[PDB]
Amino acid sequence: FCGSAMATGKFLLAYSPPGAGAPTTRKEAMLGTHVIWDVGLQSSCVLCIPWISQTHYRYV
Amino acid sequence: GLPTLSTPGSNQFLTSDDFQSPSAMPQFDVTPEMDIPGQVNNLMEIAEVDSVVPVNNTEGKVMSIEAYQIPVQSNPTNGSQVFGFPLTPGANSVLNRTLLGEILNYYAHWSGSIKLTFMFCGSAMATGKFLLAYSPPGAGAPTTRKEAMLGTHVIWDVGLQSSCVLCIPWISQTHYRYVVMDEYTAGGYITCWYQTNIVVPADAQSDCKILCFVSACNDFSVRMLKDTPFIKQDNFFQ
Amino acid sequence: VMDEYTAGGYITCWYQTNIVVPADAQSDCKILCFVSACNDFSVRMLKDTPFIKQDNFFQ
Amino acid sequence: KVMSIEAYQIPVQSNPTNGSQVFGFPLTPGANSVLNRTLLGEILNYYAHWSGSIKLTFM
Amino acid sequence: RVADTIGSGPVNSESIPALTAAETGHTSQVVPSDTMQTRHVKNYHSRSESTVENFLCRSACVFYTTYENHDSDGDNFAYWVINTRQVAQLRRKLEMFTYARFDLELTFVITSTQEQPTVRGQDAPVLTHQIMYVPPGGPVPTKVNSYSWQTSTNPSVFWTEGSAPPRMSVPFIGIGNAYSMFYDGWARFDKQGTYGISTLNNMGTLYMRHVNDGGPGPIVSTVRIYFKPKHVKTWVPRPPRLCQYQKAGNVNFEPTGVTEGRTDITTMKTT
Amino acid sequence: GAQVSTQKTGAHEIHYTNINYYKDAASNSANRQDFTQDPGKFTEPVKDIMVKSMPALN
Amino acid sequence: GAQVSTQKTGAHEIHYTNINYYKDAASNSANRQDFTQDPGKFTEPVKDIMVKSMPALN
Amino acid sequence: SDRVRSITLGNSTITTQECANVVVGYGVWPTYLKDEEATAEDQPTQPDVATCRFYTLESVMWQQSSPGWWWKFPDALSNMGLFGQNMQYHYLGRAGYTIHVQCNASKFHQGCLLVVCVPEAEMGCATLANKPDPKSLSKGEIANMFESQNSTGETAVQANVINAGMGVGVGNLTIFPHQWINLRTNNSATIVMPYINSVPMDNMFRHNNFTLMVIPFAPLSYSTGATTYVPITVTVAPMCAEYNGLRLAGKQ
Amino acid sequence: SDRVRSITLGNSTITTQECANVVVGYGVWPTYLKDEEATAEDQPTQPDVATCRFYTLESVMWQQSSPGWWWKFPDALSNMGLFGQNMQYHYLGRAGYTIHVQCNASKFHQGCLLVVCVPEAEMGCATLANKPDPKSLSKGEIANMFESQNSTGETAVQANVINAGMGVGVGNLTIFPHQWINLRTNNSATIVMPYINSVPMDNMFRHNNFTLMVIPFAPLSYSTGATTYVPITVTVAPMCAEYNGLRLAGKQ
Ligand SMILES: CCCCCCCCCCCCC/C=C/[C@@H](O)[C@H](N)CO
């Protein structure tokens, strides 16, 4: 986050495996893999995207 | 005299009291006990015995041995309902008059699993598979086999063993249900459906009867004695 | 019950300095105050509360 | 203010004077309106005598 | 028993007992010694009387009703469907807790009075009453002499006037693991129907009558019923009822002020 | 099977005796002598303890 | 827990037995047998003793 | 460190930059039902990671006039993914929850919320002779609101905040598990609620159990220029959810 | 932790949110008079908790033009409760003090005060051939003020700050026990002063001992909108006060 020290905010970062569509609302995204980032001293936050595939390898 | 102080309760006559009392016949020599077969110690020994349930208690059938006979026959359709009644053993007409129901009626609360046994009285040449089910409350009663099937069920296949048991587990939020019928204490629905059909060869009846019995399982118990609403009287019999 | 014999004193609060605030910040604030007993507290003599009346059985 | 969440809010603000009083109430937990309706006051009201130290927290 | 106040003296530290953060939802455990110079006091005060049991364990009238010696069919006998919500006092006490488990000690105070159409040579033999408890489902009486008064199974007390309040003890007869004083729910899964504490209420009915049949002069008797919780266990304390009660079967209330008011935040004049 | 307990006596300066006569525990007198006490449930339900002399918010 | 004491008998020529039945010491009978006695508090509060056979004022 | 915080349930993590502690139930942490406490005999389903995760409800905006809001659990979660689907197919169920209420402001903003979980919050009707209706009681994942004046309605809940809809001093809601969000110090409140009820398990549609109430005791306030849009979001996670009595789905 | 602070004397506690350390006298902490150092033979009174507690003097407002203020001890305390009553009834007395000067501002405010305790601060008259008068020297619990120009007066104290009323560089007041209150970092100053004098005890009316001086070296400053009312409060506590030579009360 590159705001200013006086700004605050909470974001919801999410990953949604395929199969259903892409989430079009926060209620849809939230039902999948998510982290709730709260802006504060730690400018940065990590969303780690797990490997969830039926294969082992995906094609590039 | 030993200084004493009487407390509330003195001189009342409580019907369920338990005190000693003088015997009007001092030194009366009773007649020696014998040893009669069939001693009973707990009403539950009686409620644990199968009694024939009058499932077919419709209108005019209620004064006929017919009240006891569930009709079953060959049909041109699939998954038809054979019968259905609620798990309200204390108050429902289907169950309340059986040995189990009569005993429940001398009490206010009950708890336990119940066994329903179905005995097929077709002929040795008839066959068929039925789906017996129990559905806890909350959603409605199942109106189709696909609905019933999603709950507790057994698939009875008619063959050498005429009879089959649907055991109804105790699934309640309470511990005890009232024998009295409360929506809070709703117990679910028991229903039966054709899994296949009654197939029979030519020269054999396609119409058959099925008898159904009830009794308590080993976890059953009743609590709170009360008089039954089943026996009235206008004045002393003579 | 409130007796002059049993008077317990006075609790008061005063500004020691002042509420100083920068421009663009409200100067009006609220303060909440809570109560509870310490570990030496005890009550004696049960009686009914004067806080709940009734004219006749509720139905 | 007694029928408003406002009954609970002590006002405090920047002032042009020194040492002004913010509030004041007597230590009569059982009978004074300020304290008698709190958890502590309600319990005191089921009794006739009390004794102990009391904690007032200001947030 | 309560805590001794331990003597303390001057301080000049960087430990700050007086400063906390109530946001945590945690009550400060401060004591005088933390903010002032204390002397030592050996405290002998005991909290014996605030034990939940001593608080609830005192007989309280929960109801009363009347019936008449003679006069026919409503009048003749009375009945009450047991519940603890028709009286303010007890009800507010039990209600300081969400769930409770306890035994009960019932005591009955029965008194009789003469009514005006008097008659001469009125000299009535002593009166004996009968109280019968009818568990949910039991056949209930319809007139002073219905068969149900034979009580072959329901318990009943027969008591004669002038002889000391009849009394019994009843166990925790609940069907759940505790009696619920509140129930934010419905009786039916579809939410149609009743809502609230009444959905749980099914403790039976009491029935009373005179035993000696009606004499010349009319007599009215009142039965006062007392409840005394015993062997009490209580969970989840709640705020005491503020608003007065309106109905016996629910929590319905008329909004009401948080306290009495005073002129300013500065008034020491206790109301 | 008589039980001898202690009377509420007072503090800066004796026993009773009870025999139960009924078959049911519900018939027994009150438990007026149970002095268990644990405020912690309601006064300090905080997961991270909270020391008094310490800075509440670190 | 029965207590056996002595009855007031008389002097120139026997026991009782009591069991307390209530949980509160206030319910107990009277202390009619306490014979402590100390006049000195009121009869001789003088700091410098005062012997009888002696000259009171020296 | 220690004002910061991270909670992972299922495939969801919550992080906080400035919290207090985490208030825990009545000191009790949630746990599955024990054989000694059980009565329903069928083997329970304990989905786990699919049901005990963080569900984020609709947000709400705090304004300088808001009297407060409230939500009823399990109701609020009846439509959230598999937790909701399990509620439908089962007669019985039980669960605990970790409730995390979020609300960031600025340093120039001020205000303070009470965040409480009131077990068994039976509510009064606005009109004395009626019972409130299902929807006045709970609008699902949508917060209902208290009012700063006597509500009138023929079947509405008497929502005047001062009596918290229950006929008690709102200021005493404190004996229930709670935290405060004083913008000056906090920005979230986290409360873990164990399952509290007078029965081991219960139907999740006909009984509510506990109500979350968020009530501002010191109003949102700020100088002109400061952002006026201050939402309050509520994320909740069932904990140790088990169900019993499987059958077809629905209410009825 | 450690910028926070709590001091309890008697029935009074002081807390600070942002301090420095606590400056202690000349490293000496106050203590009662020793038999080897004593000369007055009568048994002293050592009231304790009733006299060695925190007395809060009148507040003063810091403005962008204030040159400084000063108070003289014991004088400033001659009317404070029992400490003052003991001063009246006794010929002799001695004590140490914990001085806590308070002043909070905002983050947008700026300024810096010197807080010094000058032992034996004999002051000069504005007019060379006279002696200042009692009141120009000390107005009791009411601060006297320095001026930013030569004072004139026929019996006034030459209060031009630059010479601190003593004929020395105000900038060298530093060899005396002191602290600074730089609003940017501080908000209070705490100084413990041991009893310093050339005699074991002394009369508390005819001798002043030490003078507290608060002098802004960087002026209060702020942008428009910021609060302009910035008071400076002074709370003091006698420590180890003993008195000797009891008789009737007064001066004379
Ligand atoms: C011969 C006389 C026998 C009398 C028997 C009386 C039995 C009734 C005992 C009732 C105890 C009820 C207290 C109230 C509980 C309710 O608050 C709750 N709604 C139930 O969960």
Side-chain angles (χ1 to χ4, degrees), chain E residues 15-17 21 24 26-27 29 34 44 47 53-54 57 103 169 230-231, chain F residues 11 25-26 28-32 34-35 37 43-44 46 50 52-53 56-57:
Chain E
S15 93
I16 5 84
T24 64
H26 150 281
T27 306
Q29 297 305 297
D34 303 310
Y44 297 115
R47 297 182 160 171
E53 186 103 0
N54 291 306
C57 193
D103 295 332
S169 293
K230 280 194 301 191
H231 316 142
Chain F
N28 300 337
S29 70
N31 301 339
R32 312 194 98 126
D34 183 302
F35 308 133
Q37 201 166 198
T43 66
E44 299 182 277
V46 280
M50 293 223 82
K52 167 163 63 180
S53 53
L57 287 186

mmCIF file of all heavy atoms in Angstrom, chain E residues 15-17 21 24 26-27 29 34 44 47 53-54 57 103 169 230-231, chain F residues 11 25-26 28-32 34-35 37 43-44 46 50 52-53 56-57:
data_model
loop_
_atom_site.group_PDB
_atom_site.id
_atom_site.type_symbol
_atom_site.label_atom_id
_atom_site.label_comp_id
_atom_site.label_asym_id
_atom_site.label_seq_id
_atom_site.Cartn_x
_atom_site.Cartn_y
_atom_site.Cartn_z
ATOM 1 N N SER E 15 5.158 1.187 36.161
ATOM 2 C CA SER E 15 4.133 0.165 36.152
ATOM 3 C C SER E 15 2.939 1.107 36.382
ATOM 4 O O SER E 15 2.987 1.982 37.263
ATOM 5 C CB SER E 15 4.336 -0.844 37.309
ATOM 6 O OG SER E 15 3.608 -0.509 38.491
ATOM 7 N N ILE E 16 1.935 1.023 35.515
ATOM 8 C CA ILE E 16 0.775 1.899 35.609
ATOM 9 C C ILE E 16 -0.498 1.085 35.717
ATOM 10 O O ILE E 16 -1.129 0.756 34.709
ATOM 11 C CB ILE E 16 0.696 2.888 34.404
ATOM 12 C CG1 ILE E 16 1.790 2.590 33.376
ATOM 13 C CG2 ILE E 16 0.888 4.311 34.881
ATOM 14 C CD1 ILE E 16 1.445 1.493 32.366
ATOM 15 N N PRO E 17 -0.887 0.749 36.958
ATOM 16 C CA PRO E 17 -2.071 -0.033 37.323
ATOM 17 C C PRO E 17 -3.386 0.667 36.964
ATOM 18 O O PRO E 17 -4.335 0.040 36.465
ATOM 19 C CB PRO E 17 -1.922 -0.176 38.843
ATOM 20 C CG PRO E 17 -0.448 -0.037 39.074
ATOM 21 C CD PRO E 17 -0.120 1.101 38.164
ATOM 22 N N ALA E 21 -7.105 -0.400 29.158
ATOM 23 C CA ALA E 21 -7.845 -0.265 27.905
ATOM 24 C C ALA E 21 -9.119 -1.092 28.062
ATOM 25 O O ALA E 21 -9.105 -2.305 27.859
ATOM 26 C CB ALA E 21 -7.009 -0.790 26.749
ATOM 27 N N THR E 24 -10.872 -3.874 25.588
ATOM 28 C CA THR E 24 -10.633 -5.315 25.626
ATOM 29 C C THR E 24 -11.852 -6.091 26.118
ATOM 30 O O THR E 24 -11.967 -7.286 25.874
ATOM 31 C CB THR E 24 -9.415 -5.645 26.508
ATOM 32 O OG1 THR E 24 -9.685 -5.262 27.865
ATOM 33 C CG2 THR E 24 -8.193 -4.884 26.023
ATOM 34 N N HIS E 26 -12.578 -6.277 29.205
ATOM 35 C CA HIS E 26 -12.086 -6.867 30.427
ATOM 36 C C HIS E 26 -12.170 -5.846 31.540
ATOM 37 O O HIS E 26 -11.755 -4.704 31.355
ATOM 38 C CB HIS E 26 -10.646 -7.355 30.190
ATOM 39 C CG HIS E 26 -9.770 -7.326 31.410
ATOM 40 N ND1 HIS E 26 -9.191 -6.162 31.885
ATOM 41 C CD2 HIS E 26 -9.341 -8.320 32.229
ATOM 42 C CE1 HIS E 26 -8.444 -6.444 32.941
ATOM 43 N NE2 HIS E 26 -8.518 -7.745 33.170
ATOM 44 N N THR E 27 -12.752 -6.254 32.667
ATOM 45 C CA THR E 27 -12.914 -5.424 33.875
ATOM 46 C C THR E 27 -11.576 -5.366 34.635
ATOM 47 O O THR E 27 -10.962 -6.405 34.897
ATOM 48 C CB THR E 27 -13.988 -6.027 34.840
ATOM 49 O OG1 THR E 27 -15.226 -6.238 34.134
ATOM 50 C CG2 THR E 27 -14.216 -5.124 36.055
ATOM 51 N N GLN E 29 -8.780 -5.200 37.472
ATOM 52 C CA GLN E 29 -8.738 -5.833 38.799
ATOM 53 C C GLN E 29 -8.069 -4.983 39.902
ATOM 54 O O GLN E 29 -7.586 -5.504 40.928
ATOM 55 C CB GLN E 29 -8.118 -7.222 38.726
ATOM 56 C CG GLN E 29 -8.912 -8.209 37.877
ATOM 57 C CD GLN E 29 -10.386 -8.356 38.289
ATOM 58 O OE1 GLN E 29 -10.704 -8.799 39.406
ATOM 59 N NE2 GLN E 29 -11.289 -8.033 37.361
ATOM 60 N N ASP E 34 -3.373 0.007 44.816
ATOM 61 C CA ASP E 34 -2.775 0.414 43.546
ATOM 62 C C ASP E 34 -2.778 1.896 43.276
ATOM 63 O O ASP E 34 -2.004 2.372 42.435
ATOM 64 C CB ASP E 34 -3.463 -0.245 42.355
ATOM 65 C CG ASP E 34 -3.456 -1.751 42.428
ATOM 66 O OD1 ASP E 34 -2.381 -2.353 42.651
ATOM 67 O OD2 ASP E 34 -4.540 -2.344 42.270
ATOM 68 N N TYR E 44 -13.053 -9.493 57.593
ATOM 69 C CA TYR E 44 -13.768 -10.719 57.930
ATOM 70 C C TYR E 44 -15.109 -10.871 57.229
ATOM 71 O O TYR E 44 -15.803 -11.873 57.388
ATOM 72 C CB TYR E 44 -13.944 -10.837 59.445
ATOM 73 C CG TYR E 44 -12.638 -10.935 60.192
ATOM 74 C CD1 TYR E 44 -12.236 -9.938 61.080
ATOM 75 C CD2 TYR E 44 -11.786 -12.014 60.000
ATOM 76 C CE1 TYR E 44 -11.014 -10.020 61.755
ATOM 77 C CE2 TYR E 44 -10.565 -12.102 60.667
ATOM 78 C CZ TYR E 44 -10.185 -11.106 61.545
ATOM 79 O OH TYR E 44 -8.993 -11.236 62.236
ATOM 80 N N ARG E 47 -19.401 -13.317 51.949
ATOM 81 C CA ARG E 47 -20.424 -13.128 50.925
ATOM 82 C C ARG E 47 -21.462 -14.230 51.037
ATOM 83 O O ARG E 47 -22.090 -14.573 50.047
ATOM 84 C CB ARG E 47 -19.815 -13.164 49.523
ATOM 85 C CG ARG E 47 -18.839 -12.043 49.279
ATOM 86 C CD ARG E 47 -18.258 -12.033 47.888
ATOM 87 N NE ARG E 47 -17.728 -10.711 47.591
ATOM 88 C CZ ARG E 47 -17.007 -10.404 46.518
ATOM 89 N NH1 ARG E 47 -16.716 -11.347 45.646
ATOM 90 N NH2 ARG E 47 -16.640 -9.135 46.281
ATOM 91 N N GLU E 53 -28.008 -19.457 45.793
ATOM 92 C CA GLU E 53 -29.002 -20.206 46.552
ATOM 93 C C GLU E 53 -29.681 -19.354 47.584
ATOM 94 O O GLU E 53 -30.894 -19.380 47.680
ATOM 95 C CB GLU E 53 -28.400 -21.401 47.264
ATOM 96 C CG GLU E 53 -29.420 -22.305 47.965
ATOM 97 C CD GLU E 53 -29.707 -23.576 47.194
ATOM 98 O OE1 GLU E 53 -29.129 -23.784 46.109
ATOM 99 O OE2 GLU E 53 -30.493 -24.398 47.682
ATOM 100 N N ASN E 54 -28.933 -18.614 48.390
ATOM 101 C CA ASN E 54 -29.606 -17.786 49.393
ATOM 102 C C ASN E 54 -30.405 -16.657 48.807
ATOM 103 O O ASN E 54 -31.283 -16.120 49.455
ATOM 104 C CB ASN E 54 -28.632 -17.231 50.401
ATOM 105 C CG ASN E 54 -28.083 -18.301 51.265
ATOM 106 O OD1 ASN E 54 -28.842 -19.043 51.877
ATOM 107 N ND2 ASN E 54 -26.763 -18.447 51.280
ATOM 108 N N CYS E 57 -33.563 -18.764 47.367
ATOM 109 C CA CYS E 57 -34.191 -19.674 48.309
ATOM 110 C C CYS E 57 -35.013 -19.119 49.455
ATOM 111 O O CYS E 57 -34.718 -19.359 50.614
ATOM 112 C CB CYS E 57 -33.167 -20.694 48.804
ATOM 113 S SG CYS E 57 -33.874 -22.102 49.670
ATOM 114 N N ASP E 103 -34.694 -27.448 42.411
ATOM 115 C CA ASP E 103 -35.797 -28.237 42.956
ATOM 116 C C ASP E 103 -36.739 -27.189 43.524
ATOM 117 O O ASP E 103 -36.362 -26.012 43.624
ATOM 118 C CB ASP E 103 -35.330 -29.197 44.055
ATOM 119 C CG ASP E 103 -34.390 -30.275 43.541
ATOM 120 O OD1 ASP E 103 -34.490 -30.639 42.346
ATOM 121 O OD2 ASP E 103 -33.557 -30.786 44.325
ATOM 122 N N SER E 169 -42.057 -31.185 48.042
ATOM 123 C CA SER E 169 -40.858 -30.878 47.302
ATOM 124 C C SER E 169 -41.033 -31.572 45.970
ATOM 125 O O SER E 169 -41.590 -32.657 45.893
ATOM 126 C CB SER E 169 -39.624 -31.366 48.027
ATOM 127 O OG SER E 169 -39.436 -30.638 49.220
ATOM 128 N N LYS E 230 -34.739 -24.595 45.399
ATOM 129 C CA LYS E 230 -33.778 -25.233 46.300
ATOM 130 C C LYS E 230 -32.780 -25.937 45.448
ATOM 131 O O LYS E 230 -33.156 -26.454 44.399
ATOM 132 C CB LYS E 230 -34.428 -26.372 47.063
ATOM 133 C CG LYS E 230 -35.233 -26.010 48.227
ATOM 134 C CD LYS E 230 -35.515 -27.253 49.060
ATOM 135 C CE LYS E 230 -36.233 -28.326 48.319
ATOM 136 N NZ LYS E 230 -36.702 -29.372 49.275
ATOM 137 N N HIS E 231 -31.552 -26.078 45.936
ATOM 138 C CA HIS E 231 -30.548 -26.818 45.186
ATOM 139 C C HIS E 231 -30.429 -26.208 43.798
ATOM 140 O O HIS E 231 -30.531 -26.867 42.767
ATOM 141 C CB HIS E 231 -30.985 -28.281 45.107
ATOM 142 C CG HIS E 231 -31.491 -28.831 46.406
ATOM 143 N ND1 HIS E 231 -32.553 -29.702 46.483
ATOM 144 C CD2 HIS E 231 -31.099 -28.617 47.683
ATOM 145 C CE1 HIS E 231 -32.791 -30.003 47.745
ATOM 146 N NE2 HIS E 231 -31.926 -29.356 48.494
ATOM 147 N N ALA F 11 -17.587 -13.749 62.877
ATOM 148 C CA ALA F 11 -16.141 -13.843 62.783
ATOM 149 C C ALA F 11 -15.147 -13.519 63.886
ATOM 150 O O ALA F 11 -14.175 -14.264 64.069
ATOM 151 C CB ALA F 11 -15.690 -13.189 61.498
ATOM 152 N N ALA F 25 -33.560 -37.034 46.870
ATOM 153 C CA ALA F 25 -32.691 -35.902 47.154
ATOM 154 C C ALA F 25 -33.418 -34.555 47.072
ATOM 155 O O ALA F 25 -33.057 -33.587 47.761
ATOM 156 C CB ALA F 25 -31.454 -35.932 46.280
ATOM 157 N N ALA F 26 -34.478 -34.495 46.276
ATOM 158 C CA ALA F 26 -35.228 -33.250 46.181
ATOM 159 C C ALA F 26 -35.875 -32.869 47.508
ATOM 160 O O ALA F 26 -36.203 -31.713 47.698
ATOM 161 C CB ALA F 26 -36.269 -33.344 45.111
ATOM 162 N N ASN F 28 -34.434 -32.797 50.293
ATOM 163 C CA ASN F 28 -33.460 -32.210 51.206
ATOM 164 C C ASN F 28 -33.524 -30.718 51.364
ATOM 165 O O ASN F 28 -33.967 -30.017 50.464
ATOM 166 C CB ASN F 28 -32.049 -32.617 50.823
ATOM 167 C CG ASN F 28 -31.852 -34.101 50.849
ATOM 168 O OD1 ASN F 28 -32.580 -34.835 51.536
ATOM 169 N ND2 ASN F 28 -30.884 -34.568 50.092
ATOM 170 N N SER F 29 -33.021 -30.235 52.495
ATOM 171 C CA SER F 29 -32.994 -28.810 52.746
ATOM 172 C C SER F 29 -32.059 -28.093 51.756
ATOM 173 O O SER F 29 -31.480 -28.717 50.883
ATOM 174 C CB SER F 29 -32.633 -28.517 54.194
ATOM 175 O OG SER F 29 -31.295 -28.836 54.461
ATOM 176 N N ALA F 30 -31.954 -26.776 51.866
ATOM 177 C CA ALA F 30 -31.168 -25.978 50.945
ATOM 178 C C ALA F 30 -29.684 -26.137 51.062
ATOM 179 O O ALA F 30 -29.191 -26.513 52.115
ATOM 180 C CB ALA F 30 -31.535 -24.544 51.121
ATOM 181 N N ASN F 31 -28.954 -25.777 50.009
ATOM 182 C CA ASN F 31 -27.498 -25.856 50.047
ATOM 183 C C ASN F 31 -27.080 -24.465 50.408
ATOM 184 O O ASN F 31 -26.521 -23.748 49.579
ATOM 185 C CB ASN F 31 -26.941 -26.193 48.677
ATOM 186 C CG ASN F 31 -27.468 -27.510 48.133
ATOM 187 O OD1 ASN F 31 -27.946 -28.372 48.881
ATOM 188 N ND2 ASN F 31 -27.369 -27.679 46.816
ATOM 189 N N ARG F 32 -27.358 -24.041 51.633
ATOM 190 C CA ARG F 32 -27.030 -22.661 51.980
ATOM 191 C C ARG F 32 -25.553 -22.407 52.303
ATOM 192 O O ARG F 32 -25.131 -21.256 52.435
ATOM 193 C CB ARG F 32 -27.958 -22.137 53.096
ATOM 194 C CG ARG F 32 -29.420 -22.421 52.829
ATOM 195 C CD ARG F 32 -30.399 -21.657 53.704
ATOM 196 N NE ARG F 32 -30.882 -20.490 52.995
ATOM 197 C CZ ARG F 32 -32.157 -20.166 52.789
ATOM 198 N NH1 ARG F 32 -33.158 -20.909 53.243
ATOM 199 N NH2 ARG F 32 -32.427 -19.091 52.052
ATOM 200 N N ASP F 34 -22.798 -23.389 50.230
ATOM 201 C CA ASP F 34 -21.914 -23.496 49.056
ATOM 202 C C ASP F 34 -21.304 -22.130 48.720
ATOM 203 O O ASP F 34 -21.954 -21.294 48.090
ATOM 204 C CB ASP F 34 -22.692 -24.038 47.839
ATOM 205 C CG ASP F 34 -21.802 -24.240 46.594
ATOM 206 O OD1 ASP F 34 -21.165 -23.268 46.117
ATOM 207 O OD2 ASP F 34 -21.762 -25.378 46.071
ATOM 208 N N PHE F 35 -20.027 -21.941 49.032
ATOM 209 C CA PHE F 35 -19.394 -20.652 48.781
ATOM 210 C C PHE F 35 -18.387 -20.560 47.614
ATOM 211 O O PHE F 35 -17.436 -19.761 47.669
ATOM 212 C CB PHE F 35 -18.769 -20.118 50.083
ATOM 213 C CG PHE F 35 -19.717 -20.082 51.272
ATOM 214 C CD1 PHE F 35 -19.315 -20.580 52.515
ATOM 215 C CD2 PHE F 35 -21.001 -19.561 51.155
ATOM 216 C CE1 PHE F 35 -20.177 -20.539 53.629
ATOM 217 C CE2 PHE F 35 -21.863 -19.518 52.255
ATOM 218 C CZ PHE F 35 -21.452 -20.016 53.494
ATOM 219 N N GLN F 37 -16.756 -19.433 44.134
ATOM 220 C CA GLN F 37 -16.779 -18.094 43.549
ATOM 221 C C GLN F 37 -15.699 -17.916 42.475
ATOM 222 O O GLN F 37 -14.506 -18.046 42.760
ATOM 223 C CB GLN F 37 -16.587 -17.088 44.676
ATOM 224 C CG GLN F 37 -17.065 -15.703 44.373
ATOM 225 C CD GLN F 37 -17.162 -14.838 45.616
ATOM 226 O OE1 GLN F 37 -17.836 -13.810 45.597
ATOM 227 N NE2 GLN F 37 -16.500 -15.250 46.707
ATOM 228 N N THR F 43 -15.463 -11.295 34.390
ATOM 229 C CA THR F 43 -14.580 -10.143 34.572
ATOM 230 C C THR F 43 -13.329 -10.148 33.716
ATOM 231 O O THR F 43 -12.773 -9.090 33.450
ATOM 232 C CB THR F 43 -14.178 -9.923 36.064
ATOM 233 O OG1 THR F 43 -13.378 -11.021 36.531
ATOM 234 C CG2 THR F 43 -15.412 -9.808 36.938
ATOM 235 N N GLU F 44 -12.865 -11.322 33.294
ATOM 236 C CA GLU F 44 -11.655 -11.404 32.471
ATOM 237 C C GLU F 44 -11.740 -12.488 31.414
ATOM 238 O O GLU F 44 -10.908 -13.411 31.408
ATOM 239 C CB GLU F 44 -10.427 -11.701 33.330
ATOM 240 C CG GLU F 44 -10.108 -10.665 34.377
ATOM 241 C CD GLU F 44 -8.852 -10.999 35.161
ATOM 242 O OE1 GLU F 44 -8.951 -11.790 36.135
ATOM 243 O OE2 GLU F 44 -7.767 -10.474 34.802
ATOM 244 N N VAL F 46 -10.891 -12.298 28.475
ATOM 245 C CA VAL F 46 -9.837 -12.035 27.479
ATOM 246 C C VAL F 46 -8.814 -13.196 27.308
ATOM 247 O O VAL F 46 -8.246 -13.703 28.281
ATOM 248 C CB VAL F 46 -9.097 -10.672 27.768
ATOM 249 C CG1 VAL F 46 -9.917 -9.494 27.264
ATOM 250 C CG2 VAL F 46 -8.842 -10.497 29.251
ATOM 251 N N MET F 50 -3.883 -10.323 30.617
ATOM 252 C CA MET F 50 -3.966 -8.918 31.045
ATOM 253 C C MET F 50 -3.460 -8.711 32.479
ATOM 254 O O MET F 50 -4.192 -8.929 33.462
ATOM 255 C CB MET F 50 -5.382 -8.327 30.891
ATOM 256 C CG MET F 50 -5.860 -8.179 29.458
ATOM 257 S SD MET F 50 -6.677 -6.618 29.202
ATOM 258 C CE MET F 50 -5.232 -5.538 28.965
ATOM 259 N N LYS F 52 -2.118 -6.334 35.537
ATOM 260 C CA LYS F 52 -2.546 -5.022 36.046
ATOM 261 C C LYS F 52 -1.538 -3.855 35.941
ATOM 262 O O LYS F 52 -1.865 -2.787 35.411
ATOM 263 C CB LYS F 52 -3.061 -5.188 37.486
ATOM 264 C CG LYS F 52 -3.251 -3.903 38.272
ATOM 265 C CD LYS F 52 -4.143 -4.121 39.490
ATOM 266 C CE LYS F 52 -3.561 -5.082 40.518
ATOM 267 N NZ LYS F 52 -4.514 -5.214 41.661
ATOM 268 N N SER F 53 -0.332 -4.067 36.466
ATOM 269 C CA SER F 53 0.748 -3.075 36.459
ATOM 270 C C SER F 53 1.340 -2.799 35.062
ATOM 271 O O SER F 53 2.169 -1.896 34.885
ATOM 272 C CB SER F 53 1.861 -3.537 37.423
ATOM 273 O OG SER F 53 2.298 -4.866 37.134
ATOM 274 N N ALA F 56 -1.687 -1.977 29.159
ATOM 275 C CA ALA F 56 -2.805 -2.728 28.559
ATOM 276 C C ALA F 56 -2.729 -2.924 27.039
ATOM 277 O O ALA F 56 -3.032 -4.011 26.530
ATOM 278 C CB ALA F 56 -4.134 -2.078 28.942
ATOM 279 N N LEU F 57 -2.409 -1.846 26.320
ATOM 280 C CA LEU F 57 -2.261 -1.891 24.865
ATOM 281 C C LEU F 57 -0.802 -1.592 24.501
ATOM 282 O O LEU F 57 -0.314 -0.461 24.647
ATOM 283 C CB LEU F 57 -3.230 -0.923 24.171
ATOM 284 C CG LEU F 57 -4.710 -1.337 24.159
ATOM 285 C CD1 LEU F 57 -5.492 -0.339 23.311
ATOM 286 C CD2 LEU F 57 -4.887 -2.767 23.611
#
